[PDB]
Design an enzyme around this catalytic site. Structure first.
Site, mmCIF file in Angstrom:
data_model
loop_
_atom_site.group_PDB
_atom_site.id
_atom_site.type_symbol
_atom_site.label_atom_id
_atom_site.label_comp_id
_atom_site.label_asym_id
_atom_site.label_seq_id
_atom_site.Cartn_x
_atom_site.Cartn_y
_atom_site.Cartn_z
ATOM 1 N N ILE A 176 -7.456 -3.462 -2.234
ATOM 2 C CA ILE A 176 -8.163 -3.622 -0.961
ATOM 3 C C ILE A 176 -7.089 -3.869 0.109
ATOM 4 O O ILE A 176 -7.458 -3.671 1.309
ATOM 5 C CB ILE A 176 -9.164 -4.841 -1.032
ATOM 6 C CG1 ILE A 176 -10.150 -4.845 0.147
ATOM 7 C CG2 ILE A 176 -8.424 -6.165 -1.210
ATOM 8 C CD1 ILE A 176 -10.805 -3.504 0.380
ATOM 9 N N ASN A 226 -2.167 -10.427 1.249
ATOM 10 C CA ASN A 226 -3.478 -9.895 1.580
ATOM 11 C C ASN A 226 -4.562 -10.963 1.642
ATOM 12 O O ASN A 226 -5.348 -10.970 2.606
ATOM 13 C CB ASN A 226 -3.854 -8.821 0.524
ATOM 14 C CG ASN A 226 -5.212 -8.137 0.812
ATOM 15 O OD1 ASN A 226 -5.273 -7.049 1.427
ATOM 16 N ND2 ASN A 226 -6.280 -8.679 0.265
ATOM 17 N N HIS A 236 0.788 -1.229 0.000
ATOM 18 C CA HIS A 236 0.000 0.000 0.000
ATOM 19 C C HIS A 236 0.808 1.259 0.000
ATOM 20 O O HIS A 236 0.652 2.115 -0.903
ATOM 21 C CB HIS A 236 -0.919 -0.014 1.234
ATOM 22 C CG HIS A 236 -2.022 -1.011 1.148
ATOM 23 N ND1 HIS A 236 -3.302 -0.656 0.759
ATOM 24 C CD2 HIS A 236 -2.056 -2.342 1.395
ATOM 25 C CE1 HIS A 236 -4.082 -1.737 0.777
ATOM 26 N NE2 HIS A 236 -3.351 -2.780 1.139
HETATM 27 FE FE LIG Z 1 -4.230 -4.907 1.066
#
Ligand SMILES: [Fe+3]
Length: 818
Positions: A818, A673, A483
């Site tokens: 996400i 993730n 991220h």
């Molecule tokens: Fe993520």
């Protein structure tokens, strides 16, 4: 007249209102220039009617007919301006011009004309390096980049499309409380950090260095992804959890409506079996919320039921085995931290004058290495470790001063058995020591045990290790390395590479949703007293710990072969297809990862030469040179002084940089993730916090380890209320939206008009299908069961390239979405 078709999506996801004088388009020539050399521009041309003819139209889309006057003096259209005279914005998908076909892929919101300082411009789907831009479009190309960069000032508004950088000075809330002040991350040697997207809300009233709070954290408009189905707006669930759901849960505990603590492991398993009973008004808060309502089954009255985590779907006790604890270090949620150990005892680089003697207390002759001597295990490259000693030790004292946190800085020694599986052979639980210390707690070494109180102490030792691993996974392997590290490249790309640019087209699919999820995370996840701080061990020190780790972040070590070699889990070997030989042959993350890595590399190596024939062509691309200079010197500017940045003066450097960016955004993020709820949805398997040290002999807490081991464990790990919140968050983040775009896919088949690039991309998608067949064969190979499935019997599917929607434990998105 040129026949055109406009496809757009109205904001409501009424069509007569777009006719009349509502929407104007003006074609712009690529070949005929005015006296200043800018492409001539045609007359305002309005939408004339609704096209109901073509059956090929995506959901929510409408097509409009338009005819443009375009005489000889106008040449060939290469761009267009559009003006929306309606009050409400609409989503422009495309323009297609027939019998001249020219395609324009737009996929952009167009707000009312009065809101824009300059008219919206869109280019046809041709691809050009800057020296190939048709002369009448050169100025338009550069002016559009100038527009995207803005001027570095002003509060950004929803409709703005302005990309710029700022530091993480928006996490604290010092105007609410001094307890909510946080250090600025970025822009100093004390706290280096990647930059994030500038929002420009301005200073708090108490601290000119911290940005004031805001109801909406801006991202450039087309970064804020709309969804046809509200269930697909997963990034907003984080905000709803923090703002609506967490307070509702808290109320249930404050009013003593449910026990405050778990009392046995079965109380945890109950969460996905019969469920948890909560007050009605608590259920009534959840049930109507988009995204949140998908997280739980309910009777609509008092029950919430979480989904059964993959890790327990075959055996609910297998997580407790030593085999699974070690297997997850190579095929779990965080499979990228284990390192080879080439000497014994393990050494520390920390200052003993600050922390006390840092010599390891693990003795070689205490270890069960299946009959190997230590020298044999070291020589045969069978000894590995999960080493959190130097990472955590600097923070242990300040963490342990918090009321409800206690940790050790852990190190786990692993042995690679002749059968090819890892086994854990010792855990060292270290604490800092200094002369004035008030605490009498000491470091200790714990060895495996299956019976008696020693087995409980060993199970607790594993929990302290996995608390360190979960905090490192979420803050470093996941947040920092994907991220946060990626956002600067997103910003630089839009600021410096035109939509027309081939490297813009190569990289931007790998940025989908990343700025959006990150902004939502700054607001509700990693903010002061936000979800991460209240669920993870380090509390208010969590994000700053990621800054300390970023001091050691190395862009070129994010490449998968370099990572494996640096960690001592593979060696360079040019006789192997991937150029590296794994030291753990069946290391599922690395073995599957190398296949994906090779496929991306082939794609990048085939695409690049379509646009760059020599090293000079890379040196001479002014957009590319400006892009990379800014990404390094501004976006990751705190590390601008480091010698390892690629220079970008050659074809190989361009390939390397693009390859590493695509790997981070797609496969690396997927591997860290999508296993979050599958492995961590059982809090005992992935505890996020520890709350006490090991008990002293002769105390009630020690007697509890003997008499009620499950309660001793549950009192040590994350409490029940933060567990309900953590589980909800990780369930959202482990879900694939149904509108995801996966590796080997693009959102539009006409992203370029260049057939060679289109062919190369088709070959890439075919290779990924081939790879998935190979990974299926691996998971079906009984010889590989021990590492690929383990006693949890959970086939390693996290690097399968494809997936359906939902919480699937597979599928590699293009981006950090996400
Ligand atoms: Fe993520």
């Amino acid at each position: 007249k040129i026949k055109g078709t406009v496809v757009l999506m109205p904001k409501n996801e009424n069509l007569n209102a777009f006719l009349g004088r509502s929407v104007s388009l003006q074609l712009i020539s690529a070949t005929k220039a005015d006296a200043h050399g800018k492409g001539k521009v045609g007359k305002d041309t309005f939408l004339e009617g609704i096209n109901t003819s073509l059956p090929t139209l995506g959901a929510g889309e409408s097509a409009f007919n338009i005819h443009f006057e375009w005489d000889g003096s106008m040449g060939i259209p290469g761009a267009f301006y559009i003006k929306n005279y309606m009050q409400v914005e609409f989503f422009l998908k495309s323009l297609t011009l027939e019998a001249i076909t020219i395609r324009f892929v737009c996929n952009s919101w167009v707000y009312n004309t009065k809101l824009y300082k300059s008219v919206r411009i869109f280019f046809a789907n041709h691809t050009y390096v800057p020296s190939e831009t048709p002369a009448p479009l050169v100025e338009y190309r550069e002016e559009e980049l100038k527009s995207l960069r803005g001027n570095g000032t002003g509060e950004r508004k929803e409709y703005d499309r302005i990309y710029d950088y700022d530091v993480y000075n928006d996490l604290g809330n010092p105007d609410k409380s001094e307890k909510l002040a946080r250090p600025v991350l970025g822009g100093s040697s004390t706290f280096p950090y990647p930059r994030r997207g500038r929002t420009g809300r301005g200073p708090t009233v108490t601290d000119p260095n911290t940005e004031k709070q805001g109801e909406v954290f801006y991202v450039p408009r087309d970064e804020n992804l709309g969804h046809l189905k509200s269930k697909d707006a997963l990034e907003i669930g984080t905000k709803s959890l923090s703002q609506i759901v967490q307070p509702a849960f808290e109320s249930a505990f404050d009013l003593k409506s449910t026990p405050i603590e778990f009392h046995s492991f079965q109380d945890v398993h109950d969460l996905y079996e019969g469920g948890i009973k909560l007050p009605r008004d608590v259920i009534s808060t959840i049930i109507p919320l988009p995204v949140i309502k998908e997280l739980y089954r309910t009777d609509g009255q008092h029950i919430l039921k979480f989904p059964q985590p993959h890790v327990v779907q075959v055996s609910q006790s297998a997580w407790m085995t030593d085999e699974e604890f070690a297997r997850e270090m190579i095929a779990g949620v965080n499979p990228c931290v284990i390192r080879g150990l080439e000497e014994f005892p393990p050494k520390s680089n920390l200052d003993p004058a600050i922390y006390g003697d840092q010599s390891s207390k693990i003795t070689a002759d205490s270890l069960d290495l299946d009959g190997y001597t230590m020298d044999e295990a070291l020589g045969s490259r069978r000894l590995f470790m999960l080493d959190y000693h130097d990472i955590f030790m600097p923070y242990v004292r300040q963490i342990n001063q918090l009321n409800s946190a206690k940790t050790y800085a852990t190190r786990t020694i692993l042995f690679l058995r002749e059968d090819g599986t890892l086994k854990p052979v010792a855990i060292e639980l270290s604490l800092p020591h200094s002369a004035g210390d008030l605490s009498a707690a000491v470091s200790q070494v714990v060895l495996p045990a299956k019976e008696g109180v020693e087995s409980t102490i060993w199970l607790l030792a594993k929990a302290y290790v996995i608390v360190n691993d979960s905090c490192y996974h979420q803050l470093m392997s996941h947040w920092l390395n994907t991220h946060a590290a990626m956002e600067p490249f997103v910003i630089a790309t839009h600021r410096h590479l035109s939509v027309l640019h081939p490297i813009y087209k190569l990289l931007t699919p790998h940025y989908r949703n990343n700025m959006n999820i990150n902004a939502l995370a700054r607001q509700s996840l990693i903010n002061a007293n936000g979800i991460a701080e209240t669920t993870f061990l380090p509390s208010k020190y969590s994000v700053e710990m990621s800054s300390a780790v970023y001091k050691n972040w190395v862009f070129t070590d994010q490449a998968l072969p370099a990572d494996l070699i640096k960690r001592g889990v593979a060696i360079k070997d040019p006789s192997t297809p991937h150029g590296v030989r794994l030291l753990i042959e069946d290391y599922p993350y690395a073995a599957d990862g190398l296949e994906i890595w090779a496929a991306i590399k082939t794609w990048v190596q085939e695409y690049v030469p379509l646009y760059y024939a020599r090293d000079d062509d890379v040196k001479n691309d002014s957009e590319l040179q400006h892009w990379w200079k800014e990404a390094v010197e501004k976006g990751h500017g705190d590390l601008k002084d480091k010698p390892w940045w690629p220079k970008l003066q050659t074809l190989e450097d361009l390939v390397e940089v693009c390859l590493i960016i695509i790997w981070i955004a797609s496969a690396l993020h997927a591997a860290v993730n999508f296993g979050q709820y599958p492995y961590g949805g059982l809090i005992m398997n992935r505890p996020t916090a520890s709350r006490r040290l090991l008990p002293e002999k002769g105390t009630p807490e020690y007697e509890e380890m003997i008499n009620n081991h499950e309660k001793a464990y549950l009192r040590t790990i994350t409490s029940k209320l933060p567990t309900l919140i953590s589980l909800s968050v990780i369930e959202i983040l482990s879900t694939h939206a149904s509108d995801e775009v996966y590796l080997g896919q693009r959102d539009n088949p006409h992203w370029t008009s260049d057939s060679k690039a289109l062919q190369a991309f088709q070959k890439f998608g075919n290779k990924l299908k081939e790879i998935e067949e190979k990974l299926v064969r691996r998971n079906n190979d009984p010889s590989l069961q021990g590492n690929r499935l383990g006693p949890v019997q959970l086939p390693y599917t996290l690097l399968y390239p494809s997936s359906e929607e939902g919480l699937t434990f597979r599928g590699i998105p293009n981006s950090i979405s996400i």
